[PDB]
Amino acid sequence: LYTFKELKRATKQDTVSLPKLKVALLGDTATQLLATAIKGEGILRNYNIELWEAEYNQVERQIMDPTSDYYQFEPDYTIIFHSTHKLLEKHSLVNSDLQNKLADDRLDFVRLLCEQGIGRVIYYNYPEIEDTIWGSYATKVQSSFTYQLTKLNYELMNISQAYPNFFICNLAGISAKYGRNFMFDSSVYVNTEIILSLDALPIISSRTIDIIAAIQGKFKKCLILDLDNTIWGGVVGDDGWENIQVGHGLGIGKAFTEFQEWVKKLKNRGIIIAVCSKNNEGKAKEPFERNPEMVLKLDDIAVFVANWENKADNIRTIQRTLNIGFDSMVFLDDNPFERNMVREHVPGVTVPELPEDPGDYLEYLYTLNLFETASF
Ligand SMILES: [Mg+2]
Ligand SMILES: [Mg+2]
């Protein structure tokens, strides 16, 4: 993640070398900063982004008019930003008959957009704004904003499964973590029509570019794990295989269990898992083999490297074994010196700056969206 300042600075960089992509952005709130952020983020991801911005609140206007500037632009990607905030206003101004059709009408427009067949579409879904008009009782009232929005987000996912060209960017899931209190800045919105806060902007640009990059064929394929204090608490060489911290019951071992469960999901979706550890190989494998509380087993690990050599060399060994790019690899290690040396000595490998407390690893990894993809 970058700051908006860094993203804007990047838009000034020399773009000659980079492959060009034409990106259209159309929204119902003010999009000028988001445009800058997307363009700069793309450049930092090695794309020369030519970004066309529709005029304020002309989404339907541009898409509905075949002679419009939008179609003349012939974009490679079309990013649509329909905000929950503006949909909330739309809903509030109509009677129950039209409110009952809020989701359906929006879904119709989305399908119409998909049917045009114009490059790939990236579409932000809708974080819930609970209006508390009914309280929680809103779930029982079809015409309520809460019901319509829940229906809308569900059917949007079904649209993405029907149209290979249509990608959602999960603004809703992103916002669920940070909260609207952080994502939305009322004072700025009132005076500028900008709906995302300054600190939210780089989060959304990064998540938008993650999708574009994945479609272009740049996505992570492999996760490399340290062992001690990364996937279990403690040091196996000193404490023994029976004594590593993992499993339910109170305390940090539970965090390692839940973290291993995340790794298990990656393996189950085709991510290659490798181990790279400063350990005797026999000792390093023992917990996988003997400790029943391990979630990960040896058969989940494609390449297992445990020795006393520097991890940079070991990662080259792993890369050569797998024949995938260093830039398709993620390396997780609790030791800052190990992280820093892999960063310096194996450029291309992504090395997340894990927080010191293992109880915070997973929520931190969530902020990085490491495993965006574009195929099942
Ligand atoms: Mg370690
Ligand atoms: Mg280790």
From TrEMBL:
BF1531-like N-terminal domain: residues covered: 22-212
Protein name: BF1531-like N-terminal domain-containing protein
GO molecular function: hydrolase activity, acting on ester bonds; metal ion binding
Lineage: Bacteria, Pseudomonadati, Bacteroidota, Bacteroidia, Bacteroidales
Keyword Hydrolase: no
Keyword Methyltransferase annotated: no
Alphabetically ordered keywords of this record: Metal-binding
Residues that coordinate or bind Mg(2+): 226, 228, 333-334
Gene source species: Bacteroides fragilis (strain YCH46)
